Structure 1
Amino acid sequence: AFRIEKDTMGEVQVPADKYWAAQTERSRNNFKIGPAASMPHEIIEAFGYLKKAAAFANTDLGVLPAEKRDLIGQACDEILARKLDDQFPLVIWQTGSGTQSNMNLNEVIANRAHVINGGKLGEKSIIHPNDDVNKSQSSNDTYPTAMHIAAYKKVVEATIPAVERLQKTLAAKAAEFKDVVKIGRTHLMDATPLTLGQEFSGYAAQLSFGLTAIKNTLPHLRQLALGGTAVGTGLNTPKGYDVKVAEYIAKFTGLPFITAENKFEALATHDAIVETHGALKQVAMSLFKIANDIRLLASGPRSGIGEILIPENEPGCSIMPGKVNPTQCEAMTMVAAQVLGNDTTISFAGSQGHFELNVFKPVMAANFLQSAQLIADVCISFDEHCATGIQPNTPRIQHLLDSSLMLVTALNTHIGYENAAKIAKTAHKNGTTLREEAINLGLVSAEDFDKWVVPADMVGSLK
């Protein structure tokens, strides 16, 4: 069942029930690319905030009647309350400006305003999509505004807290394991001792510098395009609109948005998405390493390293009965893989602006949100279902520590490099302990080796 709606290109059959109009319907038919309604919901939600702020600012500045403001603001409250999700059917792989998603907000708000006000769907709306819902605005400033609201909100409300959660667990464990002495590995080969705390303190540190990197990118992402309209000059905006509309969005979201300092930079680039995604990708590579270590540390339990015990959450294996796997770690390394390709896509798209407009906005949008959501979700899962339950395998730690021929490094400042090297290669060649060959080569007394080669004394400076 259809009704005819009209745009400046003529007549379009629109599903009779649906609040969208001609432009939303053409796009839904002209971009049959991947799954329906793939435009992020976070982008639509952002549009809810800024269309409502546009309306509010336009009335304060004398270009929209209060009557129309309130109908727009109520239809935006419905979008925000998730009452109209079945009214946003457009894909990511549309016009690169996101014009069709902007007109989807505009047509849905106008037709929904009309029915709120007592009219029939398919009657000329009391609210015009272009002249009223879109007054003072372009797809070219509204879509980048939706991008930064969705991006800033997800990064500060989901991603930073989730990464902070895992950072504090990792720092907690580092503290909890400060007196567990273990064997280091460089190049995967037996090395000198460090505490399990020291190992985890490295991991805690990785996310601390990553959190700082992400925070450093927020001043740029807080800047909103809204007011630059078609090309950044703010043609067709009342004076004060850029500052005023950013105060509404700031009031409505609770987040410290400001108007962009250079609206030509804010339309022709998404350098801010590149900037913040770069830092997300810094954290994804640190996360990869941490997850990879932890499965290596848990490997076995009998014929691997097996120096830690991780929580056992599920049957690991359909054929190998009673096998248990570090499945939280695999989740986290696969998210990290995804984030790095997301960064290729964003970097590539960011370089591809032409003149006044970057037209890679949706794909930049979709990839940034997916990275920020997946980092958030996997740090919560990995913290809950792995990191918090990590315990030492004490006897395994103690065996692999004691077997290291490279405890011989404690001897370096006492007998010199070459004499230390003779002891280790003699023990290796002969199949004996350091302590035997140190004594039998006449290079160290039994009491000096017992005093010097003490792993608990090899996890700090001399004294």
Structure 2
Amino acid sequence: MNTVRSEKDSMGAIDVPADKLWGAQTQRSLEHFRISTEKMPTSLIHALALTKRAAAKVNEDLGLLSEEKASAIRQAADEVLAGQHDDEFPLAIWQTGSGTQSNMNMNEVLANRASELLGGVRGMERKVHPNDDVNKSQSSNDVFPTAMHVAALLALRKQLIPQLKTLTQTLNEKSRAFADIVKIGRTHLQDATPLTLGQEISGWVAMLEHNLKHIEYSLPHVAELALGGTAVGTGLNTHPEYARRVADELAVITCAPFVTAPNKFEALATCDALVQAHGALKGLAASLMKIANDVRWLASGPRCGIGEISIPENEPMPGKVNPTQCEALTMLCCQVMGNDVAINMGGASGNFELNVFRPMVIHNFLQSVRLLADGMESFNKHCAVGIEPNRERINQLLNESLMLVTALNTHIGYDKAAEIAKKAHKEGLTLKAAALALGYLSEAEFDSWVRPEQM
């Protein structure tokens, strides 16, 4: 729509497209911060709407906001949650480090919309006001950090963790199914002593189980909300019960154990909870990177690699099955690693009463959660559930190796056993062929003595 609406702020008037619900401040920011293409994540936008919804409910309970106004604001917030106004937040991540502009973005949209809901109009003659009504008892300084934690905790609880558990179950079922399949071990990439495929996979299972605990340990710090600390953390210009009540409200509407932060100065001055929580995520990325690599190397071939297992072929050189899911997973694991560095830099750069590197920090954090969650979900259903053993190749490899020589020690002594191994190695023979050439035992004795199942 070409038609504009004249909206204004302390700096004056500015034209805002008529079909949009934002106001003067969002328009100015739009024209001043034309940097790249990254905008606030949908999850962050919703967490912000949830924050305003809770504040309005509590402001009402405290008699600070009229029931009518509070009711409309709450109704407008739910529409945002319903995903009806995704197009009303055009601001880039690269704005003021406090997230003030996005706070104002939400205030203007909620104000203009709540006004219409009350039978009013959008624009300067709106019935609900961005700062006076919607931002009542708040500050960008304590609101943005709160929305960050709400977004982060819910994402971890509802997206990441469930997917992690499902992948663990799948690998655990595989572990039990292949418990009896003996394969050759590999250390330093070299052939080594045997272990079952089930045991190898149990290592992957334990890794995921350990990661889950680590992620759980990071949750209580992210559950702490800054809301109530206002501008510098003192809680100036607020009702004494506000901080506790708004945290209770959020906990109630989300069903998550949110608590108000015991120290508001630590909550406004840093992003410590997220720096620590992301530390657990980069650990999960390192574990996943290893599991994904093991899978693609074990399935390499089909003739000139390892080929001990086969994985589902999902896309359209006969046996050339590219391990694409493994490639998407390893690539996103590198991304999480780099995201951690950007986060550490921003988290270490707070000054005095406020950390102004917030948009960037939350941008990287929510991206890593999405990547890890969707990545495991994709890897699980498009690869993990269909992992199968190439029993013939496995056995071929086992019998061609020199590692089974240890089974002969108790029967013929170390010296003769090592002699057999050396001969087979220098001459390019199998352990059996060498043993028989030397005449140290009969083929029947070899077949009875070398049982890989007793490794």
TM-score tier after normalising by the smaller chain length:
over 0.9
2:338 pairs, out of 335, 341, 365, with: 341
Deviation at 1:446, TM superposition (A): 7.0
Deviation at 1:125, TM superposition (A): 2.1
**Aligned letter for 2:234?**
T
1:399 is aligned to 2:399: no
Deviations 1:48-83 (A, max 9, x none): 111011011112122222122111111111111111
Q: CA deviation at 1:124?
A: 2.5
1:30 alignment partner, one of 24, 28, 32: 32
Q: How far apart in 2 are the matches of 1:23 and 1:8?
A: 9
Count of aligned pairs between the two proteins: 453
1:319-343 deviations in Å (ceiling 9; x for gaps): x577321111111111111111111
Report the AA paired with residue 81 of structure 2: L
| Paired residue secondary structure (2:264) | coil
Specify the alignment match of 1:249 in structure 2.
Answer: 250
Q: 1 CA distance for matches of 2:334 and 2:410?
A: 44
Q: Deviations over 1:60-116 (max 9, x none)?
A: 122222122111111111111111111111111111110000000111111111111
- The equivalent of 2:195 in structure 1 is 194
CA RMSD of superposed structures (Å): 2.0
Gaps of 5+ in 1: 459-463
Which moves more between the two structures, 71-80 or 411-420? 411-420
Work out the CA distance in 1 between the residues paired with 2:412 and 2:31: 80
Using structure 2 for the length normalisation, give the TM-score: 0.95
Shift of 1:293: 0.6
Deviations 1:117-148, CA, capped at 9 Å, x for gaps: 12222233222211211111111111111111
**3-state SS of 1:306 partner:** coil
Amino acid at match of 1:241: Y
Separation in 1 of the partners of 2:130 and 2:406? 76
Q: 2: CA distance between counterparts of 1:79 and 1:231?
A: 29
Q: 2:310·2:387 contact (CA, 8 Å) conserved in 1?
A: yes
SS of the counterpart of 2:321? coil
Aligned equivalents of 2:398, 2:184: Cα separation in 1: 5
Match of 1:461 in 2: none
Q: State how far apart, in whole Å, the 1-side matches of 2:417 and 2:355 are.
A: 63
Give the gaps of 5 or more residues in structure 2.
Answer: none
1:202-230 CA distance string (max 9 Å, x none): 11111111111111101111111111111
Other-structure match for 1:330: 327
CA distance 1:413–1:230, shift in 2 (3 Å): farther
Preserved CA contact (<8 Å) 2:302 2:319: no
What residue identity is the alignment partner of 2:177?
E
Q: Distance in 2 between matches of 1:420 and 1:155?
A: 55
Inter-CA distance 450–270: structure 2 relative to 1 (3 Å threshold): same
Contact 1:106–1:130 (8 Å) recurs in 2: yes
1:281 match: 282
Q: TM-score when scaled to structure 1?
A: 0.93
The 8 Å contact of residues 192 and 409 in structure 1, kept in 2 or not, is answered as no
Taking every aligned residue pair, what percent have the same amino acid on both sides? 61
Deviation at 1:453, TM superposition (A): 3.0
Pair 1:327–1:237, CA change in 2 (3 A): same
- C-alpha displacement at 1:439, in angstroms? 6.5
Match in the other structure for 2:220: 219
Residue type of the partner of 1:334? M
Q: Per-residue deviation at 1:420?
A: 4.9
Query: How far did residue 245 of structure 1 move?
Result: 0.1
Q: What SS does the aligned partner of 2:236 have?
A: coil
What is the identity, as a one-letter code, of the residue corresponding to 2:80?
Answer: I
Could you report, residue by residue, the CA deviation over 1:288-308 in whole angstroms, capped at 9, with x for unpaired residues? 111111111111111111111
Q: Distance in 2 between matches of 1:87 and 1:183?
A: 59
Q: Does 1:307 align with 2:326?
A: no
The alignment partner of 1:194 has SS state of strand
SS in 2 for 1:264: helix
Q: Which moved more, 1:391-400 or 1:57-66?
A: 57-66
Equivalent-residue separation in structure 2 for 1:91 and 1:422 (angstroms): 71
